[PDB]
Copies of this chain bind each other. A is one copy, B any other.
Amino acid sequence: ERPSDLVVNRLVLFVVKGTATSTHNTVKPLILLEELGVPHDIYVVEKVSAPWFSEINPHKMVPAILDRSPDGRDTLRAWESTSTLMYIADAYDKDGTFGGRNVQERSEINNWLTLHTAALGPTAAYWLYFYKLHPEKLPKTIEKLRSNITVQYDILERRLNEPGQQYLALKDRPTIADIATLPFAMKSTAELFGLEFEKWPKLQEWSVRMGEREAVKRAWQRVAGFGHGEKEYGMLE
């Protein structure tokens, strides 16, 4: 059984209480929702281990989405942060401004999106798990993961050093690839991993260029705030 305040009249984004370590994945769909101006509600999950929530996301994590299918026939769900980006793009990015307009664009967008999904994303998640959550401290494993993060920053830097390459996928404009990558490829996160972000100057420039976008600023301010307003948990107003 779902909670009584969980209703789907529009896209619902599931998040947890905003903290330094709880927003790096949930901010991704929120950025895209802000960029596209998609109507959405925010649901602050108290316990991701709750049975009702594993019905939405069997991986028991945020972000998750419930939305009405375009024809209204189904309650669609999206879970995994990359999958929330693909879903919002598919349902709402009519012009492929973030999703890609043609096969050529999508080919690079899916390359840089998947690189994050498969490499930087999971490495950073394992780095954080072993550094902070694992009952035993495994410093050899932690150091290898931190080393793998520098290799991923090395790839992103090489790409942003190519002529006219202002963004990861496309030269001209940011895509879901850029949105997926940003939270793990900015100064505060690099500082968390124990790295000096200035060592990747084009990547740092890119992070600032992205950070200056109004949608991204609005996303960061809101995700930090979720659960710390008049409502602690459940559907926000």
Chain B residue at smallest Cβ distance from A152 = B59
B111 touches A118 (CB 8 A): no
- Closest B residue by C-beta to A154: B58
Within 8 A of B (CB), among A185-213: none
Q: Are A70 and B102 neighbours in the complex by a CB distance under 8 Å? A: yes
The answer to whether B138 touches A58, judged by C-beta atoms less than 8 angstroms apart, is no
| Set of chain B residues within 8 Å of A80, measured between Cβ atoms | 110-111, 114-115, 117-119
Interface pair B70/A103, CB less than 8 Å apart:
yes
Cα–Cα distance between A196 and B70 once the two chains are bound (Å): 42
Contacts of A79 in B (CB 8 A): 111, 115
Of B76, B117, B141, the residue contacting A141 (CB under 8 A) is B141
Size of the chain A interface, CB-CB below 8 angstroms: 46
Residues of A at the B interface (CB closer than 8 Å) are: 58-59, 69-70, 73-74, 76-83, 86-87, 90-91, 102-104, 106-108, 110-111, 113-115, 117-119, 121-123, 126, 130, 134, 136, 138, 140-141, 144, 155, 158-159
Closest CB in chain B relative to A75 CB, distance in Å? 10
Query: Which of these, B107, B118, B126, contacts A121 with CB under 8 Å?
Result: B118
Contacting pair B119 A117 (CB below 8 A): no
Q: What is the distance, in angstroms, from A109's C-beta to the closest C-beta of chain B? A: 9
- Give Cα A86 to B114, complex, Å: 10
Contact A58 B158 (CB under 8 A): yes
Contact of A110 among B87, B123, B140 (CB under 8 A): B87
Q: Are B83 and A111 in contact (CB-based, < 8 A)?
A: yes
Whole-angstrom distance from the CB of A14 to the nearest CB of chain B? 13
Residues of B within 8 A of A107 (CB): 69, 76-78, 83, 87, 90
Whole-angstrom distance from the CB of A105 to the nearest CB of chain B? 9
